[PDB]
Amino acid sequence: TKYFDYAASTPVAKGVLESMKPWQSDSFANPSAAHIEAEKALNAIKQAREIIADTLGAMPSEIVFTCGASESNNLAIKGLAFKRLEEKGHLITSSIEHKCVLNTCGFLESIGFDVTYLTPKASGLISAQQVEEAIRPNTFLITIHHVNNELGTVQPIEDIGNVAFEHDIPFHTDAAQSFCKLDIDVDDMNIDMLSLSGHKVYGPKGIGALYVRDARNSELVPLIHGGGQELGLRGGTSPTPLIVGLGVAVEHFPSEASAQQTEFEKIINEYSFSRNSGDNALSTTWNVTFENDDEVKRFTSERNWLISQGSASNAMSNTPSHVLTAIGLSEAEARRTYRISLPPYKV
Amino acid sequence: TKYFDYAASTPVAKGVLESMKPWQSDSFANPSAAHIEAEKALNAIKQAREIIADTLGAMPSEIVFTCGASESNNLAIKGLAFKRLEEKGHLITSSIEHKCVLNTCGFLESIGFDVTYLTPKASGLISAQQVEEAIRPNTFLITIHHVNNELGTVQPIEDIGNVAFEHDIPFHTDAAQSFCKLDIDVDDMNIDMLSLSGHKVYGPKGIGALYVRDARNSELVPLIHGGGQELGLRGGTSPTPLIVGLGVAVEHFPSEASAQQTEFEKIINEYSFSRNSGDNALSTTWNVTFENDDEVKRFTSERNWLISQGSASNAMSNTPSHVLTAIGLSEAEARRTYRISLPPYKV
Ligand SMILES: *Cc1c(COP(=O)(O)O)cnc(C)c1O
Ligand SMILES: *Cc1c(COP(=O)(O)O)cnc(C)c1O
């Protein structure tokens, strides 16, 4: 009434909710147990894992369940770093990553790791060439997001993956905003690890995944040590309802825009604005800078939309979006800038 | 039909399921957002946090949401350890902890930390005196579980907490099996950190918590770095349905045994057995060693109960429960030993 903040979270699809229901009280075993009720949960988990693997062009065993892209990003990064506590090393990322990536890299710096935060162009774009130029003898990970959560910018992951392949450096991508929206083939894009989030694709909150190439033989240091779940890479009892719901979300991901809401497209033009990353953004995120404070006032008074201006930490520090300032907007411009996002769909 | 494996997981209460429902598709904002829908989620999260705090005699801010006791155990342990990567140090735990604790401590050993795994008595008991005798100049954490998940053994956490207090060593307890069943006051027991799991108390899977004394000023290293959630201690978008459901579970935790099922008590005596930790175990977990293989055969053919014999890793290695062998049972005895567990309730 009206919600235009889909890049922040999405509503659980009816089919997803239904599919979760039998695993609440009807059949509720710990999937680790040795009896038939655990068997049933395990089979349902297998189906979801296969659906996710299929969509990424991966093998089922290469899908590690987590609780979301934040935990996934942490596992990808710390999983490699924590095998290097003595010799340390260098990581390449961007300055416009989600704050979870920025903050995990900040922590790594605090324990002696070196990190380059690549600065975007005004378009929001990170180039493969800049990745290539940042490479050092001790670079051990390149992490670059696929689609930017504030701007919608589609990054050149294939070209970046090519650079990482040419140097035999692991390539991770935060795909929380691209998973299901954009077709992703892990081999075609030379991806080693990929993060995704359930509640960004009409799935439930509290679930996501990390693709890990050759997970069975992976030397990644587990973030959560546990009882053997997820090939020993990710501990904690498998939350069968959340896993099942995630599979259903992926399977029934909307194929057409964004329904009727994404028109929208006939409203927004009654206003004067500049779209940030306008030639490089997905159709479902419109990060827009209105022309002046008077236009902002008109827009917000006429439209009672729930939208977004930047990260929570920026709100707390009373500063503009880190993303907006990285792309070169002034503080005054940032004040007039809003992310209006629409129901995700394929394409 | 019939499920006697409650120590492994429990069925979500009707009130818990209902309470989750409006946060799936009716109101589904990211609680980090700045608008009214996030406000509503945040308020509901606050209520659950307060319910949990109240039950532990803690302050609301001292409750850190996680996805379960595994993630909580990892945060408690690695959160302290990762501030010591250079000087390392010593940790005291038991050899009969849940495998998540054993495996995180094993990892710490692999990066240069020293760990003492205290061996139980035949009763399953760990003593405060043994903790005291294991203390070293560089001991920086004592972690001992409150109630054992295989045996039901109630450990002397107050006495152990007293020892830790007398040395100004942090005391953590894995309370996944004791939370709500046994009255826990964090100040009375001198607890610094405490792990709990939602699906052990008729809550949903994928949620738990870590009590952290003085969380606001805690120097714990976050396991999941994120956008600022949980006072910066635990990243990832707050899963409002799971958090709300956990509060409801705690609030309506059963007050009387375990209903009718826990009779049970009139069945079990038709069989010949010895109860492990029989003088020290909760009424709702019966870890029992039948007299001979013939008695086992009689019991299993007559009763189609879903029960448990030991951890998943022990099943995979084709070895007896680590818990059972630690308490001194032979492999043959372990073969005849089953954990039969009942609906949890207060007292
Ligand atoms: C939402 C998001 C995250 C965090 O994912 P959660 O599942 O909410 O923890 C990370 N990266 C990007 C790009 C996102 O949009
Ligand atoms: C279940 C359990 C755990 C693990 O908790 P999850 O929430 O299932 O990850 C840890 N310790 C004990 C004692 C348990 O019973």
Numbering used by the authors:
A (entry chain A), B (entry chain A): 2 to 348
What does the paper say about this structure?
Here, we determined the crystal structure of the C314S mutant of SspA from V. cyclitrophicus FF75 in complex with its natural substrate, cysteine, at the resolution of 1.80 Å. In this structure, SspA forms a symmetric dimer, and its dimeric organization resembles that of other cysteine desulfurases, such as DndA and IscS. The SspA protein can be divided into two regions as follows: a larger N-terminal region (residues 1 to 254) possessing the PLP cofactor-binding site and a smaller C-terminal region (residues 255 to 348) bearing the Cys314 active site. The PLP cofactor is covalently attached to the side chain amino group of Lys201 in a deep surface pocket via the formation of an internal aldimine Schiff base. The imidazole ring of His99 forms π-π stacking with the pyridine ring of PLP to make multiple van der Waals interactions. In addition, the phosphate group of PLP forms hydrogen bonds with the side chains of Ser71, Ser198, and His200. In terms of the cysteine substrate, it is located in a positively charged surface pocket in SspA. The side chain guanidinium group of Arg340 and the side chain amide group of Asn150 make three hydrogen bonds with the carboxyl group of the cysteine substrate. The distance between Cys314 and the PLP cofactor is approximately 14.4 Å, and the distance between Cys314 and the cysteine substrate is 8.9 Å. In addition, although the distance between the catalytic Cys314 and the substrate cysteine is 8.9 Å, which is too far for direct interaction, our structural modeling and biochemical analysis revealed a conformational change in the active site region toward the cysteine substrate to move them close to each other to facilitate the nucleophilic attack.
Cysteine desulfurase, a pyridoxal phosphate (PLP)-dependent homodimer, strips sulfur from the l-cysteine substrate to generate l-alanine and a protein-bound persulfide intermediate on the active site cysteine residue. As a versatile sulfur donor, cysteine desulfurase activity is also essential to DNA phosphorothioate (PT) modification, in which the nonbridging oxygen atom in the DNA sugar-phosphate backbone is replaced by sulfur. In contrast to the typical dsDNA PT modification mediated by Dnd systems, Ssp systems confer single-stranded (ss), high-frequency DNA PT modification. SspA exhibits PLP-dependent cysteine desulfurase activity and is predicted to initiate the delivery of sulfur for ssDNA PT formation.
